[PDB]
A paper describes a structure:
The enzyme phospho­triesterase ([name]) is capable of hydrolyzing such OP compounds. Accordingly, it has been characterized from a number of bacterial sources, including [name] (Bd; formerly Pseudomonas diminuta), Flavobacterium spp. and Agrobacterium radiobacter. The present study focuses on Bd_[name], a dimeric metallohydrolase that has a (β/α)8 TIM-barrel fold with two Zn2+ ions embedded in the active site. Carbon dioxide reacts with the side chain of Lys169 to form a carbamate functional group within the active site, which serves as a bridging ligand to the α-Zn2+ and β-Zn2+ ions, both of which are required for full catalytic activity. The buried α-Zn2+ ion is ligated to the protein via direct interactions with His55, His57 and Asp301, and the exposed β-Zn2+ ion interacts with His201 and His230.
The addition of ZnCl2 during expression, purification and crystallization resulted in the presence of two Zn2+ ions in the active sites of A53_2, A53_3 and A53_4, all three of which crystallized under different crystallization conditions. Apo structures of the octapeptide-tagged A53 variant were obtained using three different crystallization precipitants: AS with glycerol, PEG 6000 with MPD, and PAA, which resulted in crystal structures A53_2, A53_3 and A53_4, respectively. Interestingly, the crystal structure of A53_2 has a monomer in the asymmetric unit and the dimer is formed through a crystallographic twofold axis in space group P43212, as observed in the structures of several other PTEs: A53_5, C23_2, C23_3, C23_4, C23_5, C23M_1 and C23M_2. Notably, when AS and glycerol are used as precipitants, the binding of OP ligands displaces the cyclic compounds X3B or X3T initially observed in the apo structures. Indeed, in the [name] variants studied, OP hydrolysis products could only be observed in the active site when co-crystallization was the method adopted, and only in crystals obtained from AS and glycerol in space group P43212. The electron density in the active sites of the A53_5, C23_3 and C23M_2 structures co-crystallized with methylphosphonic acid clearly indicated that the ligand replaced the six-membered ring present in the apo structures (X3B in A53_2 and X3T in C23M_1), and two of the three O atoms of the OPs are in close contact with the two Zn2+ ions at similar interatomic distances of 1.9–2.0 Å.
Residue numbers in the entry:
A (entry chain A), B (entry chain A): 34 to 262, 264 to 362
Write the structure that this text describes.
Amino acid sequence: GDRINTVRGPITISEAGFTLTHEHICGSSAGFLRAWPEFFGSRAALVEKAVRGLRRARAAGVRTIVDVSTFDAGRDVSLLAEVSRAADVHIVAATGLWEDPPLSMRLRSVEELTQFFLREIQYGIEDTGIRAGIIKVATQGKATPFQELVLRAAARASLATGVPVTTHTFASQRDGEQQAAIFESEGLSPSRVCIGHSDDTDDLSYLTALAARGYLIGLDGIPHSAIGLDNASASALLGNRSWQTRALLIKALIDQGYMKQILVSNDWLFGFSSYVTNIMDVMDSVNPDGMAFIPLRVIPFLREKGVPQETLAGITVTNPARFLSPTL
Amino acid sequence: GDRINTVRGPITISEAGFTLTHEHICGSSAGFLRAWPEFFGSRAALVEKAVRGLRRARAAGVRTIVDVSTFDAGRDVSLLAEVSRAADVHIVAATGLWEDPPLSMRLRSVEELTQFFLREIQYGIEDTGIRAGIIKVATQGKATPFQELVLRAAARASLATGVPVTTHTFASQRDGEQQAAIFESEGLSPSRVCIGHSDDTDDLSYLTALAARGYLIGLDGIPHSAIGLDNASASALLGNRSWQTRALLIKALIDQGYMKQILVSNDWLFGFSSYVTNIMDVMDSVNPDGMAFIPLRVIPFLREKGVPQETLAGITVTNPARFLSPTL
Ligand SMILES: C=C1OCCC(O)(O)O1
Ligand SMILES: C=C1OCCC(O)(O)O1
Ligand SMILES: [Zn+2]
Ligand SMILES: [Zn+2]
Ligand SMILES: [Zn+2]
Ligand SMILES: [Zn+2]
């Protein structure tokens, strides 16, 4: 209620501080880091890289990240706890399902999925006792039949616990509209939902249609850009819009009166096995600041564009605390 | 060379004894049993069910099973070792990839996949030190581009180590023909390959085309039948051919001179989360003998049809030892 669950236990709302609401320690697949740690060099190399990156983010002002890696994105909460302790940065873990559920998940009913999400929120993840503080869901265009069940189960789990829901979208296909429709059919308040990857589109009619009915808007991939990259795989993933173009959507929604509904993040990672080999090297070339990109480069950019510091503090501190605090 | 790796260490060829070459302790997905053990009631309930089933198979004469669950079928070698110790039945574990690889596998090259398979054969699975004694691969119709890489990587891993390859097929689509073509393009001897689920078809021209060029023929789902089952999901999985019809394919290949190339098994499981809920209950209703079905019902059936006991001993003891013994 007045506590947010992290990988090291409950924290008070004021302890969260400056919070990045959509990040990843390691974007992988279930069991993959355990079965093939050499893919990342070594598990120890991955830990060290993440600790260094989180320590640099902390020096830039970050106090909490929300790791929105699910079961099928290879979430390893023991890894998150280790890196969180070493870097002195709170990490909120996720339940839910992302874009790669295995058969043992894809065959389940809405009731079964709700049981699984509630397990990870209310009891713990695996045998770790670590509880999720957010529910992550995904569509990539029109929802599959199974994805409709996932979104409904996420709504039921959030209605039982007060934990918020955050989504992956194909933003240029306006996925958030169908996601909202399904969420609302289950009775979920839009104030409990962040429609993510919304900085992937420039369509203000789509974005304000979501914000007008009360959704939080996840402008969460600000440094994702392949401008300057011959590299087909990187351009497909990162897009050809500049980080400045994405960042100006923050100002656009402020100027329309939605400052309390904006969540900002990097959607960064320290390991990334669910895409092409060496993508992490390419991404780190594009954005050497990693997760510190938001405070080091986006915040000063918005200040120079005239956004008051108080407004940016509200977006990076107040909005995440309101979102993450469990409530109906 | 003269040792077969099991989940409890190396065993001599003569220790293997009566061997079921295609079985599963638990057909699941990577990480699923760890994240949601209540799906199986409890992990302890699954262990007890498997120990009881393996003890009954041992009483019927079974000494070894080959668990052909891969990474993506949720293979948990620690579970296999626990059940193997409690039941006093050797268990050979598998590497490879089955029909549900996650993104972190599906994006890999043939070289990367070969590294992963060799890791599990030569070094160990996860951090357990348990080494795989077989490589499992799968197609379901025409091979996907990725499945072609998997079959090539399996061939390269087998060529480096002498460990055999065993396959999942859509037998009525004659998948074994393309699998053989890819294997042979990499230089793999057919004597190192079992084309599995071959009892799913009655096409003798397909089966003898594989056997004539030297492949082992996996007649591995003998008790799979939905005769007597209204139940659409079970009929889709188990088929409408009787176990006697499947078993008579053993006699057919003996009568054509291929007795040394036949491998027989149940393709049974004690847990099964990668299909519809409660499928395990339906399967256990169909075949209460479980993994003991081959010795308790198929062997006497073939004897009554005139197959000499020496021939059946060759199929159930000699052929698996020759297949599993590492060699080029
Ligand atoms: C940049 C990434 O990595 C995986 C998670 C994602 O969907 O947010 O996309
Ligand atoms: C009966 C089953 O379970 C999963 C493995 C399979 O492909 O052999 O099919
Ligand atoms: Zn995403
Ligand atoms: Zn993400
Ligand atoms: Zn199979
Ligand atoms: Zn099988």
